[PDB]
Structure formats: C-alpha cells, structure tokens
From a paper:
DapE hydrolyzes N-succinyl-L,L-diaminopimelic acid to L,L-diaminopimelic acid and succinate, is part of a biosynthetic pathway that is the major source of lysine in bacteria, and is essential for cell growth and proliferation. All the DapE enzymes characterized to date belong to the M20 family of dinuclear Zn(II)-dependent metalloproteases. In order to examine the role of the catalytic domain of DapE enzymes and the role of the active site loops, we have engineered the HiDapE and the DapE from Vibrio cholerae (VcDapE) by deleting their dimerization domains. Removal of the dimerization domain in DapE enzymes renders the enzyme inactive, even though the resulting truncated proteins have structures of the catalytic domain that are remarkably similar to WT-DapE and AAP.
Deletion of the dimerization domain led to a monomeric structure for HiDapET. The monomeric nature of HiDapET in solution was corroborated by size exclusion chromatography (SEC) and dynamic light scattering (DLS). The structure of HiDapET was determined and refined at 1.84 Å resolution and the final model shows two independent monomers in the asymmetric unit. Two zinc atoms were found in the active site and reside in the same position as in dimeric structure of WT-HiDapE separated by 3.40 Å. Superimposition of the active site regions shows nearly identical conformations of main chain and side chains with rmsd as low as 0.15 Å for the metal ions and side chains of residues involved in their coordination. Larger differences within the active site area are observed in two regions containing solvent exposed loops. Region I (residues 176–187) has been engineered to replace what was originally the connector/hinge region formed by two loops linking the catalytic domain with the dimerizaton domain (Region I). This region is highly flexible and is disordered in the crystal structure of HiDapET (no electron density observed for residues 182–187). Region II (residues 209–224), which corresponds to a loop overhanging the active site metal ions (loop V, vide infra) adopts a different conformation in comparison to that observed in the HiDapE structure (rmsd of 1.5 Å between the structures). The structure of [ZnZn(HiDapET)] is virtually identical to the catalytic domain the WT-HiDapE with an rmsd of 0.8 Å for 248 equivalent Cα atoms.
Numbering used by the authors: -1 to 181, 188 to 210, 213 to 264
The structure:
C-alpha cells in the first residue's frame, strides 16, 4: 500500500501540470529526476516544440520499454467541471482531472513499477526503458516518431514495448490491445500479471499511432491500462484502487518477462 501511495502522489503531481499538447509543463523533468536517482541513464530528445525522454536501466537485450505521453487534450469550459481540471482532487476513491485516465495515472504506475523492480533487482537481465513524449494527442510529427527514428539511426533495439494507454472497457484488466491496424513473451507476461493480480483474464483486441511507430522497430507492442470511459471528457477520473492495481500489474509483468 506504500507503493499504491507512491503511484497516487506521482499521478497528482503530473495531473497538476497543465500539459496541453505539445507543452510538457515539466512533467518529463519530474519523471527523469526520480529515475536518474535510481541509476537510469537519461537522454533528452527535444525537437521543435515537443519534449521527448528516453530513459534506460541496464545494458543487455532484451529491452522492455514502457511508452506513454505527458500531454493532455483541452479541458473545455470549466463551468462543466465539478473539480477544477488540474486540481488532482481525490473524491470518494476517484482521482479527478484532465489526464487522470489518459494517461498520467498509468504513466505514474509504469514509472513506480520500473523503480520498484530496479530497486529489488539492480543486476537484472536486459534493459528497462521509458519512452515518453509531450505530443501524442495532437499532430505528433515530432514526438514518439522522432525518438523511433533516432534509435533506428544508431541501430538501437526495442524488443518489447508496453504502451500504458487506458485499454480497459468495463473492468480493469478486461482488455489488452495488440497487433496491426490493418491486420509473444510480452502478451504472455501482461496476461499472467493481470490474472495473478486481479483474477481475471484479458481479452486481446486488434491502437495508438505511437504504438504503431514503435512496432516498426520490430518490437512486440502491447497496450494495457485503466478504464477508458472518461478519457477526453469533462470530469475525467480514475480509481485510486485501480492505480494501485496497475502498479502491481506492471511490476509483475517485469518479473514475468525478465
Ligand atoms: Zn488521448
Ligand atoms: Zn493517450
């Protein structure tokens, strides 16, 4: 529950930053500061008006990357909101705010999971990476695609990539996303982690453009994350209990995988 608490605190810190695309508003800095403290190598890839982060712990393959974005969609009229959109207020077990579901809650859970994992296993096989962009929700010409190009140009590999977009439809863990728009161990690892943590089996469905670009590297790409019912809406929120479970699920995934 200590870990749950860390996930929630980080999510609030992120939510409070009004990172309307492509403006990062310091979210990637918060994130890089925490990881750097645990021995992660920090690489900044800014391009035009977009901020991108590539953070890695480890040297060897397999390379497992967590990918996500710090940007959020406009709020709409504030008179429609019960809590102000960037307040990160917790009401009857729900964390409210623009970004809470899409995707700052899940971003916080991936981060806490990577940290927890590295703290327990500093000599872990393979490499744990985070790939974070400030522009997924708008035009995205200079976001994840820039990072992918940069990595490909120097023959740097990603084996597996967990895209922390909110994938759950009715109940947390009910839906995982994989495959191609037009028709491995990662899928296995996340499926088991979900089963083991919350006792249900996800349905694999056939998808963000961002995931789509990472897949061009020949990474196995899977999307998993919280309930998506409230994304891009007023009074966007996410269950704190769910954030807690996400943390556990991601950590378990790494265990399973590495
Ligand atoms: Zn979105
Ligand atoms: Zn998103």
């Amino acid at each position: 529950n200590a870990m749950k608490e860390k996930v929630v605190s980080l999510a609030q810190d992120l939510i409070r930053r009004p990172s309307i695309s492509p403006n990062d508003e310091g979210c990637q800095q918060i994130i890089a500061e925490r990881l750097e403290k645990l021995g992660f190598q920090i690489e900044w890839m800014p391009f035009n008006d977009t901020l991108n982060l590539w953070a890695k712990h480890g040297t060897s393959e397999p390379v497992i990357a967590f990918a996500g974005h710090t940007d959020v969609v406009p709020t709409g009229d504030e008179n429609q909101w019960s809590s102000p959109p960037f307040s990160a207020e917790i009401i009857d077990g729900m964390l409210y705010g623009r970004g809470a579901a899409d995707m700052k809650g899940s971003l916080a859970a991936m981060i806490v999971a990577a940290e927890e994992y590295v703290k327990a296993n500093p000599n872990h096989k393979g490499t744990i990476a985070l790939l974070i962009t400030s522009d997924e929700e708008a035009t995205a010409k200079d976001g994840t695609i820039h990072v992918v190009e940069t990595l490909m140009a120097r023959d740097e590999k990603i084996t597996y990539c967990m895209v922390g977009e909110p994938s759950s439809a009715k109940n947390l863990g009910d839906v995982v996303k994989n495959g191609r728009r037009g028709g491995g161990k990662l899928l296995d690892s996340i499926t088991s982690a979900i089963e083991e943590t919350i006792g249900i089996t996800p349905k694999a469905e056939t998808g963000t453009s961002d995931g789509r670009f990472i897949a061009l590297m020949g990474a196995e790409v899977v999307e998993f994350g919280p309930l998506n019912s409230t994304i891009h809406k007023v009074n966007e929120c996410v269950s704190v209990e769910d954030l807690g479970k996400c943390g556990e699920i991601y950590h378990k995934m790494l265990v399973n995988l590495l």
